[PDB]
Amino acid sequence: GVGISTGTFNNQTEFKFLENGWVYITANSSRLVHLNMPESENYRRVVVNNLDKTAVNGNMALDDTHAEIVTPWSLVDANAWGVWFNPGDWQLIVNTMSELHLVSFEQEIFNVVLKTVSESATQPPTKVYNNDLTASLMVALDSNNTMPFTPAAMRSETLGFYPWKPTIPTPWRYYFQWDRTLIPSHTGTSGTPTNIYHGTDPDDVQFYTIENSVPVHLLRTGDEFATGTFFFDCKPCRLTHTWQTNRALGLPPFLNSLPQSEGGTNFGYIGVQQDKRRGVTQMGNTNYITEATIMRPAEVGYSAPYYSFEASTQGPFKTPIAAGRGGAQTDENQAADGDPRYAFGRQHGQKTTTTGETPERFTYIAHQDTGRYPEGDWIQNINFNLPVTDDNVLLPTDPIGGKTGINYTNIFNTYGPLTALNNVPPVYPNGQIWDKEFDTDLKPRLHVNAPFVCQNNCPGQLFVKVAPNLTNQYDPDASANMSRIVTYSDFWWKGKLVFKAKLRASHTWNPIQQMSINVDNQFNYVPSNIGGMKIVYEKSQLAPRKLY
Amino acid sequence: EFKFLENGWVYITANSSRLVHLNMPESENYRRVVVNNLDKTAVNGNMALDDTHAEIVTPWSLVDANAWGVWFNPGDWQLIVNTMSELHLVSFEQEIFNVVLKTVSESATQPPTKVYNNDLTASLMVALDSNNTMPFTPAAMRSETLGFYPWKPTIPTPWRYYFQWDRTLIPSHTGTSGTPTNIYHGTDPDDVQFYTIENSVPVHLLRTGDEFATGTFFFDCKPCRLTHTWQTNRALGLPPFLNSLPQSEGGTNFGYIGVQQDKRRGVTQMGNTNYITEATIMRPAEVGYSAPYYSFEASTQGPFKTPIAAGRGGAQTDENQAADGDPRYAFGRQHGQKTTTTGETPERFTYIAHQDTGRYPEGDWIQNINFNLPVTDDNVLLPTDPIGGKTGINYTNIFNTYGPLTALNNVPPVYPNGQIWDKEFDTDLKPRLHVNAPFVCQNNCPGQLFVKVAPNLTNQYDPDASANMSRIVTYSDFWWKGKLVFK
Amino acid sequence: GVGISTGTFNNQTEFKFLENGWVYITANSSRLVHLNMPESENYRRVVVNNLDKTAVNGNMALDDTHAEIVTPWSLVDANAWGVWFNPGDWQLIVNTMSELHLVSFEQEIFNVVLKTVSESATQPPTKVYNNDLTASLMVALDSNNTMPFTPAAMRSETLGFYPWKPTIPTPWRYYFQWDRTLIPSHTGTSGTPTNIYHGTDPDDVQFYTIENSVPVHLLRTGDEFATGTFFFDCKPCRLTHTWQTNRALGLPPFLNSLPQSEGGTNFGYIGVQQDKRRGVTQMGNTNYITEATIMRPAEVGYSAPYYSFEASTQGPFKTPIAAGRGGAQTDENQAADGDPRYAFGRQHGQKTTTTGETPERFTYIAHQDTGRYPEGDWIQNINFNLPVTDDNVLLPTDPIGGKTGINYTNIFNTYGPLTALNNVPPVYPNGQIWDKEFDTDLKPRLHVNAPFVCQNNCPGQLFVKVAPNLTNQYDPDASANMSRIVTYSDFWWKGKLVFKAKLRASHTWNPIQQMSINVDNQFNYVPSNIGGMKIVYEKSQLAPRKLY
């Protein structure tokens, strides 16, 4: 009731060691959640069209045009690593574990409190906060997944990552179908390229409402709500990275001459003339057997067009790629297409005492060597007469379509039946944990935003909303917006995310990479003298594994 | 042995035995060796000749029987390929027996002389990596498997494996100005994997009276077809009805469809044309696919050729047109080359598969969506049109038509030099096939077998000295027997 | 028999994960062991006296005088970490484990081979090696520990640390009682200080022989020998380090003024005048309560005389200390008394391809903060009148005995009933694993050479010796030394050392120290281009733990 708590705070992470090197990881997360009443009680169909930006020739990548339904509901999303693990737990997992299985998820709301605000007309303004013991919090669990799936991690709008910091839900909204055409252009393009919002296709209209699709629980201060346990059906997530490219697959050539002294220039030598060597190649018209030409079982990674923008009914979108760029591990400045860039605020890692709306950002450079170095690619004539002449080779420095800044690698695609690739690594703390699989007939082989993909279903989205607190003058048949008592709710959210992981084994003489605190990064993991906190991103696939 | 089961199935047991000759290793230590043929790649336009890499050279030797020639003589192969329609890989086992170890004493006599004596107490070190902890290094790729002749003694191959390295090689051509970046960058510490047999695999010491058997390993692979498909997209489904049939035999007596092309009935995917032709009629899917050919992609370790699943079209008619996708094998006198030949020039052949799943890029073209026929120059891209200003490069060199509709076959077995089975990659997303072997190991396939002559020390050994160990010159002859079972 | 092997090589390390976070670590180690016949078949009582060195005034620390029995036997000692774990295994243990229990030890000898050498009188010298199928290797296991305990790790004379490198045993010898007096001196000392070897005390004479005390097995090429499993009875060894000194024990003072901005100089302030504070002190005649004077439960660590040399019957010896020096963690050059220094050759970590007899060396700097910073000590008069005047304080810069280079800290001892200290950390790879407890009535609280101390008994020492291979001209009643066929043996040694360890837990928000491969140390863990190997030392108590 009014004076009785309905739940307990718990933010402990439990590691229970099972038999045969398996560990049962239970991540308990609890948060105080602050919820204001919605700006409006009505659903809105809102169109955004930043014509001012895209009207500048060459700015088509800046398109924000879309249509969305703005709802009075708020989304409680815990689908991000930082919600469940602090840096120490993450270190333990990524240093001691080799693979991760997502097992189950459950959440509850308890200790609901609803308050009203009265602001007097006194010349020196003043306001008072009073409990509304009979007011209700509306809670809806879309366990059947009737609503569109809108994971908040993509917008950095999940629950906060600090147990001792109150957090907020995010106002819920979803895309509403629209037709939009945007012809690309460049600086110096003559005229005005077609840039039009065409409207909505009636056959694609889907207006969803929570009230018509999901049972809604009314929670007074003495009530609680528990979702029950949901069990996942996902593939395991590897906590190791592969390093072998095509060049490091299989038996190396036999070295007939080995170095006799230590030193930088004391190389070995194969010792057999290149066109007199033994082995197998797929180049049926040459006798050269080299590390570049020797047959490999398949292809590790693939080349794809990079910063290619494809257009469909709704306008242009960047073509996604599975893996990051090669060479970024050596030079951070070379991080580009395929290296996810995260931008987030003070709830999710940015130093909490900073000021301004400029977000904290980082580009994740995965340890896996499955990318491409397009500056190193080339195409040459089938005749394969070496050394190749200018007319018989296409180089990455050769312009395509007359454009000095575009080469064939920009439009190149080597994905095929022989392609082998890995799933995206977890991105702590801002990365998404699980994602919903598409309801297309043919499904993608992976998702680029989360390591765990929901093959059949994963937990229903949790929606909350302050129930309307009407004054005595309400008139439903009037055009003016409803008159409401200013009401807001604080409730406690507790979730339990269960993983299963395998303890790693030492396979090599040498030690392996391990996440460690050091003098440089020390102060990223403790509060500042004024309580300021931050959570820096951490890599997750530290240890290597042999691909082949 | 061919044992005929019920309902047209045959149990093929291939027994193979070899005398194996093993010298003691050159060195007892592991070596991390870097190869860098900068002299070759420093010539502009020779980037395809890159041999730069790093490898761990081990004192161990690999006994590899993963090649068709190890198990079947030509008569057996004829029987299989003429009478069978599909092949299942069932099991594999191997053993080492009748171990013999000998020492060599070479006198200082002015006329040199040497004597061979049995070392009855010396041991052969044998390690079976049944857990597949070691890198997978199939010897067939280097033509370094056991020999293909039962009556010819054979040797194992000195074992080594790749060690991670970073390498950048900017491509160039003749006439390229300056020196393109050509650098060996070193090793990434996070990718370092130094494997040793001693720390990972139990090691058996075999004296002359001892033997070793691996036990039977059972495979889990897909069946391998011994038939070839010939139908391309043009030969799928119902042909057009011929309203006029020839009345006499002769070369020029063709049939005729007899319906004007834009007045025909049927289904096409060209939604803006009324022409229904054998080229434009809808087919269920695509047989084969076009891929960039002699395209070299670069990654952390340097450039490598982009592999392709099927060979070139037209090679069946003209051998000289065999190119990308037609595997070329080079091998020595242990593996097919006339054993009485002299010199180190290997025997070679390009395998031309019977399957018609390839492409004839000279016959491709792209034309404008408007599809106004006959197409004009500006509305068609031909294989003879230069790309990037290069007269020797056309769009087919960079073309890729792989998609959801692509259908293709597994690589055919290549007797005798072809690999039999291969290990599947440990990536999250796995390739649909391998180009080197018809049988791919989905979970695991037999552990690699390693052998090494145990060190035979003299009386003057000093472990705390920098000089390399002083050993009695010792070598071993042992008999290897394997059994490979097919269905 | 002759053609049948009697054992299998195994150098695998197995980690078996038990229930409740406990792991069963099995370290298998195998080595090829090379043994020459002894130089002499007789026991020798040999006296060493480097009078030439100690005769120089001020060189008394260089005394090597002693007496020892030189035996024809050789000792097979596997009591060092490097014998059992490669760097990867050690990384796994020290990064994932919190404590270590020594469980059991067993060893065996197999595949014995004995060979004879015949060197012809030919003008160009030549030699031939022939198997002596009937010769024997003599093997004795002192399971009753009748022989003196002589752990080889102290002399860096254990089995080698590389499975693929043949190793040797060490010629066995033990101390024989002697009386020796060496009066200390300095440069400028007048005359010749007494420097005399007095002989042997008859009541302390102990002449041990293997033959009279231990059953001896004769192994021909077809025989093997197994010790059986020995189970230890030792205390657990912690793999965490304490950092709290007396200054960091208990409740800190309450800060009445907290900083308002981030920055280097924004300190907090206690905000209460020092002599007006509340709390408890052991200084019964002062009202000052400060972090230096506030009562702490006990004392962490202790001060001891450093580079003090005590003399007894056998001459001077350095006074050992339990913990290393304070400040060495910040500056390596300050490593001194209490920081063990290891010197070793190419069998035990030194780059195997180096030349010369100069050994590789390192000083182990433990992570635990249990030492002392003597430059920071002082003593002041009981009156405690502050600020203290010169006459009322003894500073570390005040000479003692008139010596400008000696201060009271050199002779200071604060060990008492309140002292708290930790056991010595394991030193990989050269550190001793276990040590035998003294047979004195009152036993030391720890040993400085090994973390595991043998309370009742630990495995008997293993002795080997090539049995005498006589020629036909042997005459026992002649004074000349015995005429023997030049014979030597190669045998395979295999040992199994079993540990039990507890998996660590994450107790803090922040991550902890972890051993990791990196660009700097990368090439310490892989062979050189000519096969050269090395094993660098690794720290073992990386993770912190709270003392109080």
Side-chain angles (χ1 to χ4, degrees), chain A residues 222-545:
Chain A
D223 296 311
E224 79 302 320
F225 171 90
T227 62
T229 307
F230 180 95
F231 297 89
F232 291 90
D233 59 7
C234 307
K235 330 190 307 323
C237 169
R238 304 302 278 283
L239 296 177
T240 58
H241 74 273
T242 60
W243 62 267
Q244 288 167 276
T245 72
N246 262 54
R247 281 287 289 265
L249 299 180
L251 190 61
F254 180 72
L255 308 189
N256 287 280
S257 151
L258 295 166
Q260 303 298 283
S261 181
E262 289 184 17
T265 62
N266 303 124
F267 302 107
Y269 300 91
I270 294 164
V272 185
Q273 177 197 150
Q274 288 191 312
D275 69 357
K276 302 295 190 178
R277 283 167 191 183
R278 302 167 185 176
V280 186
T281 76
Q282 274 205 317
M283 321 200 37
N285 65 325
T286 189
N287 291 348
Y288 284 116
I289 309 188
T290 74
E291 288 300 281
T293 65
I294 197 163
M295 181 189 272
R296 312 290 179 166
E299 190 165 336
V300 178
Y302 68 106
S303 302
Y306 46 100
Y307 296 173
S308 152
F309 284 85
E310 296 174 77
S312 197
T313 297
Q314 269 100 58
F317 54 87
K318 197 193 83 75
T319 304
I321 199 192
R325 315 263 305 165
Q329 287 175 12
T330 291
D331 177 13
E332 177 182 317
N333 190 52
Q334 293 172 40
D337 188 42
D339 302 297
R341 189 155 176 78
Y342 289 79
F344 46 95
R346 291 177 271 281
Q347 287 209 86
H348 303 117
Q350 178 174 39
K351 190 30 163 323
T352 53
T353 54
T354 52
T355 60
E357 311 300 355
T358 294
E360 180 71 38
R361 302 188 198 86
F362 70 85
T363 296
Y364 190 89
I365 313 302
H367 280 125
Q368 66 177 333
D369 300 329
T370 69
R372 288 286 182 276
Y373 179 58
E375 286 77 14
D377 307 343
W378 73 93
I379 304 292
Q380 58 180 106
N381 184 284
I382 192 68
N383 284 355
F384 200 62
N385 295 330
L386 304 186
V388 68
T389 59
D390 172 42
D391 283 42
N392 289 328
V393 62
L394 197 64
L395 297 175
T397 47
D398 287 330
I400 287 295
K403 305 309 187 73
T404 66
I406 305 294
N407 67 80
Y408 86 90
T409 68
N410 295 105
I411 58 166
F412 202 44
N413 187 349
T414 62
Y415 184 67
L418 299 174
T419 303
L421 65 153
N422 291 317
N423 201 9
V424 294
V427 177
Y428 177 85
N430 307 98
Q432 190 168 330
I433 302 185
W434 68 84
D435 197 19
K436 194 186 74 164
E437 182 61 281
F438 291 2
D439 192 15
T440 57
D441 309 328
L442 302 183
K443 311 221 185 337
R445 304 183 68 185
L446 75 167
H447 291 12
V448 296
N449 59 331
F452 297 104
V453 174
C454 301
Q455 285 212 341
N456 304 280
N457 293 304
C458 47
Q461 294 178 126
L462 180 61
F463 301 101
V464 299
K465 175 188 164 293
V466 181
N469 205 8
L470 304 177
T471 68
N472 68 310
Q473 293 163 341
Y474 176 67
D475 183 3
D477 279 298
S479 54
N481 275 302
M482 162 194 337
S483 179
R484 293 174 298 165
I485 298 163
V486 175
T487 308
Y488 71 99
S489 180
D490 304 325
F491 58 94
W492 294 84
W493 172 90
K494 177 165 68 171
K496 190 207 299 321
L497 189 65
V498 171
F499 296 83
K500 173 180 77 276
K502 170 183 209 37
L503 287 165
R504 79 175 182 87
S506 184
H507 328 262
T508 61
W509 180 269
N510 59 285
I512 55 140
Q513 189 171 30
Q514 299 277 264
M515 152 186 203
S516 182
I517 200 167
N518 57 46
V519 63
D520 306 315
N521 67 26
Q522 161 161 231
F523 294 112
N524 295 340
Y525 306 107
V526 299
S528 73
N529 71 338
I530 58 165
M533 285 288 305
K534 90 183 54 67
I535 308 184
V536 301
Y537 81 97
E538 309 288 352
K539 302 197 186 301
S540 56
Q541 287 194 341
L542 305 179
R545 77 163 181 286

Side-chain angles (χ1 to χ4, degrees), chain C residues 201-264:
Chain C
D201 183 359
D203 305 313
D204 306 326
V205 170
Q206 293 193 304
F207 172 36
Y208 299 101
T209 70
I210 298 296
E211 292 81 356
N212 289 99
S213 281
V214 191
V216 177
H217 292 72
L218 307 175
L219 301 192
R220 293 180 162 174
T221 184
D223 296 311
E224 79 302 320
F225 171 90
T227 62
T229 307
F230 180 95
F231 297 89
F232 291 90
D233 59 7
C234 307
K235 330 190 307 323
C237 169
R238 304 302 278 283
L239 296 177
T240 58
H241 74 273
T242 60
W243 62 267
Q244 288 167 276
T245 72
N246 262 54
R247 281 287 289 265
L249 299 180
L251 190 61
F254 180 72
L255 308 189
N256 287 280
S257 151
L258 295 166
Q260 303 298 283
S261 181
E262 289 184 17

Side-chain angles (χ1 to χ4, degrees), chain B residues 376-387:
Chain B
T376 59
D377 172 42
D378 283 42
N379 289 328
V380 62
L381 197 64
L382 297 175
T384 47
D385 287 330
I387 287 295

